[PDB]
DNA sequence: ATCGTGG
DNA sequence: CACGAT
DNA sequence: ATCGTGG
DNA sequence: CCACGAT
């Protein structure tokens with residue numbers, strides 16, 4: 001069956017959180033982050049809290065024993081007033097001391113405060129936020145376990161990758177599309193993935209109106225491929241897949257036309273192979289159902305329309321995923337072989353999730369853009385610091401949205 | 403798993419034609435028809451041909467050895483020309499000699515001629531048509547074997563029934579609804595089935611306009627239950643299910659209202675138990691797909707909407723949508739009954755007396771479609787009007803196979 | 804904002 | 811807004 | 817119209 | 824609509 005590759009050449013089965021954590025303890029993550037200061041800051045508001053003391057102690061021991069990040073110092077900073085300027089002051093003090101990342105405890109679920117601060121941190125340094133009011137002894141082990149998966153990832157580590165056949169699937173997968181943040185405004189995104197689930201590069205457009213969609217969809221995709229290719233100049237792309245997703249303008253024929261043009265221009269510029277084999281797929285979550293056997297089940301609805309019956313992580317809930325081939329340059333002879341590889345690849349990618357230990361059972365090429373969209377929409381709604389990925393190698397190559 | 407009951411208390415697995423045929427050889431069908439003349443007529447226009455001769459000897463040996471119908475004689479009648487008048491002449495000659503059924507060989511595909519003759523035969527005597535031109539290419543063995551399943555059924559035999567649990571399922575299933583034969587015209591149907599898949603009674607309305615749909619739906623259903631109850635005075639109808647299907651007017655709210663009323667009125671008249679538990683279901687064939695077993699699998703789409711993955715390298719699925727549009731049930735028994743009605747529908751999908759190969763579509767949906775095909779084409783090519791109401795053999799035999 | 808999922 | 815996850 | 821299916 | 828397949 002499918003397995004995750006972790007450190008020292010080890011692999012562990014999927015769908016088993018306990019064996020994955022024990023694997024990390026024994027062998028380390030697939031890639032330990034390389035840190036510059038060996039220092040992280042814990043910023044909080046309860047200098048004498050027993051729960052804060054337990055949290056810091058668990059963070060310290062699991063970073064060392066689970067993630068094999070050794071000899072990290074955790075420095076503490078306390079803010080007085082639970083308001084933006086007071087907290088930002090401590091964030092700035094921490095940044096001025098030399099830290100690799102900031103772990104920031106906020107009092108409660110104050111949404112405008114959260115997004116103003118989170119937008120500031122994303123623009124400054126890797127960060128992991130936490131809620132003081134939600135901490136609890138009962139949940140602290142699970143809380144810290146999962147929190148560190150995404151924090152290590154935000155520091156540039158690679159917790160685990162998918163073990164996949166190097167001879168099958170795509171050389172890169174581009175998750176692309178757009179997300180409306182209200183009835184008029186939207187932003188485009190383009191993320192490059194390796195078939196083992198790792199994100200290589202990501203770009204987002206500025207917020208624009210729907211009438212600007214096709215223009216920025218092409219330029220955003222070209223920017224992400226230029227960035228991938230500049231930093232991976234020998235990565236040959238002979239087989240390419242686009243996974244298109246998001247709530248976006250109804251324009252299907254014209255979107256597909258522009259996506260083909262974009263690939264054709266990338267071929268002309270030698271960004272992918274001049275004889276790249278590619279397909280453009282629409283991925284859509286469809287209405288769940290319950291069976292009254294489907295792990296990795298592929299359903300053919302027509303030559304171009306498929307359903308992947310993804311299990312939800314009496315009745316067995318199913319969270320189906322619709323997969324439409326809207327364009328491809330495949331031969332009739334290789335078509336159904338290629339169909340099986342791209343559907344398998346989608347199923348494998350649905351096992352990749354660096355938000356925490358449990359799989360989301362949704363392809364990372366769809367899921368990570370939804371995370372980005374949540375942040376971009378709310379930062380705009382609550383007037384935070386705009387997030388500018390281009391020209392920021394840290395934002396382009398790290399999963400800051402987890 | 404599921405089995406078919408055949409003769410002499412024997413049962414054979416479903417999904418296995420070879421064992422079904424052998425089982426019939428050893429034990430006979432569930433019910434051998436009782437014939438009045440022990441005579442079948444073969445009517446054709448190929449006298450002294452040898453393809454006719456081996457057809458007749460395959461028919462002769464198989465009705466005897468597979469169907470256990472002993473001592474049958476087959477008489478031949480030759481018509482001089484492949485036209486209605488000439489053939490009708492020999493049909494009439496055969497009927498006057500006293501025969502239990504007619505096997506009629508036509509020379510080629512001739513749709514007006516076929517529906518003229520079939521509608522005449524349906525109004526006269528059990529019949530089976532055959533085409534001489536495609537008989538020459540086919541493997542006669544498979545041809546006659548399947549031919550005889552439906553001919554024996556049209557003569558009133560029961561090849562096999564479903565083995566089902568007498569304490570589970572509906573006491574009767576009424577498959578009802580209507581089918582359009584063009585953009586404006588339709589007819590209603592209502593067929594009463596036992597849970598073992600056997601048809602007890604059928605009625606059809608005359609062809610009417612869509613605007614007449616609801617009035618003839620209630621009347622067609624009342625007629626089928628009256629007819630069934632007069633022939634089964636002692637049958638206690640305490641659990642009733644309706645399977646509504648067919649390409650019909652889009653009047654779901656009004657149709658449901660009408661059906662609920664009909665069931666109510668039937669309770670007043672003691673056609674069904676004062677305490678009858680009933681449910682009204684819409685059955686709809688949905689678009690086929692392929693899995694790249696589902697045998698008996700049930701999918702819930704919502705609390706009232708279900709999907710059966712009927713089976714019919716890829717696995718072709720012919721799904722059936724099942725929506726519960728009304729029911730009598732308490733919330734305590736509700737999900738117990740849902741599983742009962744969905745199993746029952748799966749079971750009914752194994753009943754097909756058109757040949758040996760199951761059609762994997764419930765008989766409450768399939769047989770109305772067979773009827774619709776005949777009614778639509780008799781009206782389009784001007785055959786003899788078909789109505790069972792004044793004809794017990796049409797009301798109680800699968801003339802439409 | 805540890806997450807997710809079923810209300 | 812509840813609660814369970816290894 | 818053996819009947820089904822699939823291209 | 825033509826053509827294989829089925830026990």
Ligand SMILES: C[As](C)(=O)[O-]
Pocket residue numbers: 303332333335336
């Ligand atoms: C091989 As095809 C059904 O896409 O022409």
Ligand SMILES: C[As](C)(=O)[O-]
Pocket residue numbers: 116383384385386
């Ligand atoms: C958070 As601001 C003042 O850059 O919109």
Ligand SMILES: C[As](C)(=O)[O-]
Pocket residue numbers: 518784785786787
């Ligand atoms: C009822 As007629 C076939 O004689 O028109």
Ligand SMILES: [K+]
Pocket residue numbers: 524528529530556800801802803
């Ligand atoms: K008949």
Ligand SMILES: [Mg+2]
Pocket residue numbers: 150401402
């Ligand atoms: Mg997060």
Ligand SMILES: [Mg+2]
Pocket residue numbers: 552802803
């Ligand atoms: Mg027939």
